[PDB]
Amino acid sequence: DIQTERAYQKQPTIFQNKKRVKLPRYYKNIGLGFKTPKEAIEGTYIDKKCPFTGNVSIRGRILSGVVTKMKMQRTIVIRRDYLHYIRKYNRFEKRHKNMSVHLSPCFRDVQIGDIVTVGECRPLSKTVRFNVLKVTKAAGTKK
Amino acid sequence: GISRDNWHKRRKTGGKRKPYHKKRKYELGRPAANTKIGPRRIHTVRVRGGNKKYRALRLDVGNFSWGSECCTRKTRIIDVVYNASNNELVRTKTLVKNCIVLIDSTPYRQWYESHYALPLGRKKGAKLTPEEEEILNKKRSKKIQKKYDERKKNAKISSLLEEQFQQGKLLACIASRPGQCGRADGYVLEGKELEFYLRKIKARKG
Amino acid sequence: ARGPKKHLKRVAAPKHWMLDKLTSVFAPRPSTGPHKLRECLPLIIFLRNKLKYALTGDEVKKICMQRFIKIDGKVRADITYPAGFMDVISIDKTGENFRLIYDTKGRFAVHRITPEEAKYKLCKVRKIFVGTKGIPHLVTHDARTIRYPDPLIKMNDTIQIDLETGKITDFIKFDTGNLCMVTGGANLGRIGVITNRERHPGSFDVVHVKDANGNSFATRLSNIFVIGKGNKPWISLPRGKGIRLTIAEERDKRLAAKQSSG
RNA sequence: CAUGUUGGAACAAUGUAGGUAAGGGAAGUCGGCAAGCCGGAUCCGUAACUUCGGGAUAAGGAUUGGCUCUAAGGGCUGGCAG
RNA sequence: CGCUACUACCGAUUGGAUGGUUUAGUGAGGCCCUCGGAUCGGCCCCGCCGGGGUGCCCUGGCGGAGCGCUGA
RNA sequence: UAAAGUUGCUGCAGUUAAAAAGCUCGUAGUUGGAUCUUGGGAGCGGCCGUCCCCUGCUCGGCGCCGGCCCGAAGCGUUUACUUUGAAAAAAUUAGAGUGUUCAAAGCAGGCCGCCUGGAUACCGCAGCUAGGAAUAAUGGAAUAGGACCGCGGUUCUAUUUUGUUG
RNA sequence: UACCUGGUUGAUCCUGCCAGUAGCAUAUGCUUGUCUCAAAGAUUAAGCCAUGCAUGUCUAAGUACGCACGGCCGGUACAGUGAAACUGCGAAUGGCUCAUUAAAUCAGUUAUGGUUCCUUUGGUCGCUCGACUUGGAUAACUGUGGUAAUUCUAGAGCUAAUACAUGCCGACGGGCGCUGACCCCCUUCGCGGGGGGGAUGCGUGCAUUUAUCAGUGGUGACUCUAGAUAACCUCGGGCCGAUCGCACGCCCGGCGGCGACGACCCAUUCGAACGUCUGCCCUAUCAACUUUCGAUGGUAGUCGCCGUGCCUACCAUGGUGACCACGGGUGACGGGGAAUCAGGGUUCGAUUCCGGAGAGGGAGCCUGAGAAACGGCUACCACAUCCAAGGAAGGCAGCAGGCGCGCAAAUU
């Protein structure tokens, strides 16, 4: 389950140590018009870099990419295909900036090839400046 | 000096950056406070913008909020017991943010007697014969003893604070930065937090 | 670049002051105030070349430090005071006054008024604060915390406070058809009305601005002021009468003042 | 077992076998001969050349004491407890 | 093959000279912490004397300590 | 730098002048078949040009006798492409504007107090904003986990209410 | 203005190059009547440098007895100027040069809800229930003292303060919270029980700490802003005005009109810094790169103005690349621009505007709001002027002027 880690993972707002006689979970809305899922609020996991149930505010640019790797933890590698116009040779070329993105852990089942939504914020880490805001399931996966 | 520059180290790919300028002042490091538990020894440090920053070097005063009923009294700090950051910061008794430090129960033992009138612990057979607490545990007005009847059924102690208030040792925590502000303020561990930071000590026992 | 600049080159001086390149070699890096370097016409050039009161740095300085220039109820003695939008300037010797409006072109409204018009200012808030014991507070275009506002005044809205005291009288709540003044770019003073409101949460909220001749375009909500209600201004206007004449019609009437005028 | 077929008293030369040497450092000499240095292990790092096997303990560096803890590495009996 | 004229090439020389990055060793100088304590001022009980409430005292020209205590 | 179409995007060349791998296989890369909204309905122009249309309903009016529609609004595969708009230092440059008396400059001055200048386009790409949906992508139902209707059920639980009290 | 001509042949048609042709911008050659704007030690050496100055500065507004001058009405002090001193504020602006630096710098572009900011401006400056104005030294002044001095330097005797420091009246009389003597009413038999006063013991502003409890204004969006409660407070603690100029009444120690400053503080402006997105020359005779000595993440901190492997700790094993990563190179500061130009392009930008970088080479730091500053300092490494041979002093890539360099660039 959870809290097989060193320091007490908690939300720095809610309480859970009062006299009675299922812990109360704090979330928020994000702006732009995005939906926090059932899985965020039904579950009991504890994370701080989420734009919904954590300390980060989404502002500036909001971009999209396609998921390539999920071998890191709480952060994914997405990829941004675009065409670059060279003025001399009136044609294009494939380039990509596979930007480092934090994996907002409210998204339970994300696969590679899923079109993600990413929002600019303050830097979470050295290269990470983005969070996951929505995910679409693979083309089938019937079994 | 010791810098907080982003350019002295490697890129995403691996290739090393080449420095285009020498170190700036704003990219700044000063050594860790390494603040002991002693008498109140605090050096002030000037910081960027012409402001102070209080370096605790020895510090054992600060207030801790008993989270259940929310009472807070400035208490002496006695022992650093746990630190998830480094197991060796416990040894060289250094106060940092999220140090699980011991404080005295006597300012809160005072308050719970001065509000609820219930003596805790004191192994069965032990009365108080000099008698300051027994007339704080008996002999009120006739009808405001019913105020202590409306404060009896829902003032029952926590599962494992019966075995903390008895020994005069509260597992407190530090939620300020004594290397930045020169205080050691925080709260008293309770419930599942108390069943976490005591799980981290008794698992080491056997 | 280890401290603040104290010179500013005249080739690098902003064009909206309409200084040359040859006479001046530097520009006022001003002794500042409630509006920006770009977003002000400073009290030196608003004096020394746009009614041409003063000539040299000797001549300009010998007007300010006497306490003459009656700026919104407290005379201040700085030649480089940034005078932006919806403040009040007054002259106390010549018998002259100003309200700070945008003309439809790059430059501001260089326009004279009476002291009666220089008695109310229309202080649009940029955000609303609440103080240290649940007391409301304000953050305006001129950054003013003159508190106890109207409960129907929100961020996007313009308030009317009295100059003598600093207490609210009227306001303009955000409504479609309020007399508009776009405070941005080349539309920097389109004297029209708000004709539409549609949302850009996170991006920049779209408000379509209709100039009186039915000119349909849009600017972000950031830089759209509202000068009054419907057709009637609460303030006296500059010339042009809010039409934004195109490059074509600058040959039409301006040459027509050479036929019948001489 | 009784110091190797003898003992006692002296502690000169010159020997035989050990050592130690300020500053220099092979100027000694046929010749670095004799002596010296290096030496173990852990941990780095390892060239020319090559029959790709090697060269290789190449070369060249770092640590090593005591005491005191900590973590990791297993049986057994009827994801556990003893 | 043979004269002539430059031009690069290979080549013993454990060739030479240079910039830049770097492990290893000894390590200037600051800064920080830990003591330090040279000095420099205090506070007290009393000694020599005072002026008034009353041999007990509140303010004092002037010497000496337990450095008792305290600070830059 | 132009001439140089002797670096070739526009715009070269490879039978013999310099040049096609000896030959196929092959991965990225590059380029990839046709195919999915059609014509008439409704007024005018001087038989036919143009216009107007054939997407979904919590707030509000020319209103109105549980209710008929229309405007503000949260919300309608995505991408490229294209148009507009936002913003985008001057200087230089092109030049509206104006006689440095010429020229390059310059926001000068002009009429016997007043009037007027100090704009504008461009600013590859990239970002933003609102249309268009041709062109090329790229999807949606296949042991249907199917779009669309109101049901049988199973929980958290808005508030309109059980005279005030529980 | 969208262009061609000569040259291999005995003559030919061609591929093809060399050569003309025209600008352009460095030198150089010879020649130089008028006047106008006007480049200039960029290229080689960011090589070396002989005096000086450009950063300090004096007013009706901390502050003033220099006898330094000089006015008269003096004993209610301080007339009115002007010098060091310093509370404080400037030397971080400029000017110069292009060495490093290849997603750097930089450009457009949005971000700070990640922060800092004297000046400048909004402001708040009896909210707390517990002084008629104070400390005891210091500065300049001043005398005596040496040491070649160099902007080198002790002791004595005086002493001012928006310093160095302590702080009290008033507002003030309560309200705001608990433990509560005590009383007003009683229903049922006494106990069980339902509501208001009231002595009094305590605690109670503004920034920093957690937590409890509902959610009063606000942005697209809070752990914003809050309400309040337990109340918590660095001798190296935030403020709670020990301020000034000139007017000044009613009055015999009280009231008030207009300036002045600085902080706790929030809100600006000038900014700064870290960030987002997209963009750059050559190179495969650079194909893998980076990583229990930080590589790419987590989580707790450490520290920093704040966001971050920025730096530690114990974990996970990532990140990047055939869309050229990484490595090497550049007679690479980038851009705004420049030359040429049918259309496309191509070369150039050290040079006056902007952004960055550096002050021989590196490195460390004081001060200040703001330098990792060199017209500051401290070293080490190189260069180099004094020396009385003990020991001092120094930075022209600021402006002239040397020296060296060169094809190449002015008047101390």
Side-chain angles (χ1 to χ4, degrees), chain B residues 1 4 9 11 13 24 33 46 54-55 63 65 72 181:
Chain B
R4 295 174 63 76
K9 72 181 293 174
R11 302 166 49 72
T13 61
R24 302 296 179 188
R46 191 204 171 190
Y54 307 94
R55 301 298 175 79
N63 198 334
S65 309
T72 207
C181 67

Side-chain angles (χ1 to χ4, degrees), chain A residues 6 12 15 21 26 28 37-38 40 44 48-49 51-52 60 73 77 86 96-97 100-101 108 117 127 132-133 136:
Chain A
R6 297 297 179 81
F15 200 57
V21 315
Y26 164 76
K28 74 160 190 179
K38 175 178 162 74
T44 189
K48 75 173 292 184
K49 292 195 164 175
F52 302 104
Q73 62 177 56
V77 191
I86 294 90
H96 69 275
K97 296 292 189 72
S100 298
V101 175
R108 196 179 69 197
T117 302
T127 77
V132 172
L133 276 76
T136 63

Side-chain angles (χ1 to χ4, degrees), chain A residues 6 9 26 49 58-59 61 82 96 98 123 126-127:
Chain A
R6 297 297 179 81
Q9 291 294 111
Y26 164 76
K49 292 195 164 175
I58 307 305
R59 80 291 173 94
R61 298 189 184 283
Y82 62 97
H96 69 275
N98 54 345
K126 185 169 182 299
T127 77

Side-chain angles (χ1 to χ4, degrees), chain A residues 62-108:
Chain A
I62 303 93
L63 303 168
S64 181
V66 64
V67 175
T68 183
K69 292 174 176 64
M70 292 172 285
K71 297 177 177 67
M72 304 170 81
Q73 62 177 56
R74 301 178 179 281
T75 185
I76 52 163
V77 191
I78 74 165
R79 188 166 174 278
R80 295 190 64 211
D81 269 312
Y82 62 97
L83 288 174
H84 184 256
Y85 183 68
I86 294 90
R87 64 177 181 79
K88 176 181 186 181
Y89 305 124
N90 302 121
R91 291 98 184 282
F92 298 129
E93 58 179 5
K94 283 185 181 170
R95 289 188 192 180
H96 69 275
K97 296 292 189 72
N98 54 345
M99 58 166 57
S100 298
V101 175
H102 188 275
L103 187 278
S104 181
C106 56
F107 298 92
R108 196 179 69 197

